[PDB]
Design an enzyme around this catalytic site. Structure first.
Site, PDB file in Angstrom:
ATOM      1  CB  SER A 132      -0.762   0.291   1.067  1.00 48.16           C
ATOM      2  OG  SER A 132      -1.983   0.597   1.109  1.00 48.16           O
ATOM      3  CG  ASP A 177      -5.967  -2.725  -3.067  1.00 44.53           C
ATOM      4  OD1 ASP A 177      -6.863  -2.147  -2.189  1.00 44.53           O
ATOM      5  OD2 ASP A 177      -5.457  -3.226  -2.861  1.00 44.53           O
ATOM      6  CG  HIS A 208      -5.703  -2.988   0.942  1.00 42.09           C
ATOM      7  ND1 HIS A 208      -4.375  -2.528  -0.545  1.00 42.09           N
ATOM      8  CD2 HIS A 208      -5.448  -2.125   1.834  1.00 42.09           C
ATOM      9  CE1 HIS A 208      -3.680  -1.448   0.075  1.00 42.09           C
ATOM     10  NE2 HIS A 208      -3.767  -1.404   1.754  1.00 42.09           N
TER      11      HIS A 208
END
Length: 267
Positions: A132, A177, A208
């Protein structure tokens, strides 16, 4: 003839395995230099110096989200530093600095006779990974430091352009995601990068966290991260077939592979 080659010839099974062939130990960094904290994973007897890889988590997350890469890669002939950031609320530029600070300290300790990684590291062969905002930070690191040999971010998040990136880059994406949605992050990042060798693994049904510690695709995701780092950090063309050959072709019929994009061959 390849001075950087390590461990026995790979197979489908050796790459999907939870571990490579090398014994490994870890240690906590006593005085973290420009980052929050660090664990270093390393092979005890690699039969030569190995490349090093710095791995960063996302917003609010800690080493435990990304640290399965430590043993998974160290067991394959790499030194791996997994960091916590000075703050859990650090943004991607900040995570990039802390990522390179972490690589620098690994370089520092490779030259510290008291450190267990003393003369275990080829300090010219460096790579970056992360989840991320920490994945976005890996792409920012590769953009700012093109001597890096590899980037393999997972579900990256950034508000930057990566058209200038020349570092070989595997993006691992999670199909579903909604935190770093691929249509705004992974996919644009992939498309922007015209100057590099690159690949995009899209995991089917993946949220995610589809590439984090304890994920159920660790076999396949581990295979692509190791093959990637072997190919580009070690120049090891024994791993080329898993990225561009029939072995790679066989993977395209797997349930877990929503999509795979690449610009093979890697010459």
């Amino acid at each position: 003839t390849n001075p950087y080659q390590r461990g026995p010839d790979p197979t489908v099974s050796s790459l999907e395995a939870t571990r490579g062939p090398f014994s490994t130990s870890s240690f906590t960094v006593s005085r973290p230099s420009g980052y929050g904290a660090g664990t270093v994973y390393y092979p005890t007897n690699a039969g030569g110096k190995v490349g090093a890889i710095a791995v960063v988590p996302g917003y609010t997350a800690r080493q435990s989200s990304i640290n399965w890469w430590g043993p998974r890669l160290a067991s394959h002939g790499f030194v791996v530093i997994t960091i916590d950031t000075n703050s859990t609320l650090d943004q991607p530029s900040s995570r990039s600095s802390q990522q390179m600070a972490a690589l620098r300290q690994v370089v520092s300790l490779a030259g510290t006779s008291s450190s267990p990684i003393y003369n275990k590291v080829d300090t010219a062969r460096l790579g970056v990974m992360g989840w991320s905002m920490g994945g976005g930070g890996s792409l920012i690191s590769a953009k700012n430091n093109p001597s890096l040999r590899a980037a393999a971010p997972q579900a990256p998040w950034a508000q930057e352009s990566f058209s200038s990136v020349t570092v070989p880059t595997l993006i691992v994406s999670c199909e579903n995601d909604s935190i770093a949605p691929n249509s705004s992050h992974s996919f644009p990042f992939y498309n922007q990068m015209t100057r590099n060798k690159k690949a995009n693994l899209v995991i089917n049904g993946g949220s995610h966290s589809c590439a984090n510690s304890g994920n159920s695709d660790a076999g396949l995701i581990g295979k692509y991260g190791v093959a990637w780092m072997k190919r580009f950090m070690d120049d090891d063309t024994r791993y080329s077939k898993f990225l561009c050959g029939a072995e790679h072709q066989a993977d395209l019929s797997k349930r877990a592979v929503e999509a795979y994009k690449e610009n093979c061959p890697y010459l």
